[PDB]
């Protein structure tokens, strides 16, 4: 009964936020959208030709097809039944890269360099990403000044 048409809840989401109204920058176009690139979706208000849908905003997908002045992305969308991989045709202006895969490739390159150094010098490296360890038995310093005594203040309106 909410009149389920296209973009019935997009008063804010497909809007340019503040001090950004105008022509689109050209570095949005001048990007390398090859196949297999993990990209993100963020709709634009200026270009009304290729915004995907209000349901795919903020999602993350994989490129399968590239054309003249758009791109094709497969996106895992959740519905009532189960999540499904869906094929969308989105223009270039709505799409940016995802730096998480780039950070993972940087970690893979650093691990390969550490493994090359390990095979060279015979030194074990422990290249697994361990989480935040518990704090070691470290040592504090209280020289010069006594610890400052804190007391709670009285109530004043």
């Amino acid at each position: 009964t909410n009149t389920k048409g296209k973009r019935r809840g997009t008063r804010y989401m497909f809007s340019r936020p503040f001090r950004k109204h105008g022509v689109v920058p050209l570095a949005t176009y001048m990007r390398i959208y090859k196949k297999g690139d993990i990209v993100d979706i963020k709709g634009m208000g200026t270009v009304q030709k290729g915004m995907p849908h209000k349901c795919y905003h903020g999602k993350t997908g994989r490129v399968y097809n590239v054309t003249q002045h758009a791109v094709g992305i497969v996106v895992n969308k959740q519905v009532k039944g189960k999540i499904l991989a869906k094929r969308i045709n989105v223009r270039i202006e709505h799409i940016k890269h995802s730096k998480s895969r780039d950070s993972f490739l940087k970690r893979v390159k650093e691990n390969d360099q550490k493994k090359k150094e390990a095979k060279e010098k015979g030194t074990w490296v422990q290249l697994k990403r361990q989480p935040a360890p518990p704090r070691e038995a470290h040592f504090v310093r209280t020289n010069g000044k006594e610890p400052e005594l804190l007391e709670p203040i009285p109530y004043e309106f």
Binding site: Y64, N65, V66, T67, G72, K82, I83, A85, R87
Partner: protein, 68 residues
């Protein structure tokens, strides 16, 4: 005789009765939905790969087996 209209109560529990599934298995991804000019590239490229790849790859395999 007014009835209850619409609800999504007791729905996520029915979703998780059977463990909502990723498709999770697509090796050698499907090819339909891709640019027909790119397909006119790729099919002719594949059949000429099937035709004319013998002698140069054979001599390259012999050369890399001799050099390694």
């Amino acid at each position: 005789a007014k009835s209850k209209n619409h609800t999504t109560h007791n729905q996520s529990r029915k979703w998780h009765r059977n463990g909502i599934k990723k498709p999770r298995s697509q090796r050698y991804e499907s090819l339909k939905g891709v640019d027909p000019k790119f397909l006119r590239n790729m099919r002719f490229a594949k059949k000429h790969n099937k035709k004319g790849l013998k002698k140069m790859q054979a001599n390259n395999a012999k050369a890399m087996s001799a050099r390694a």
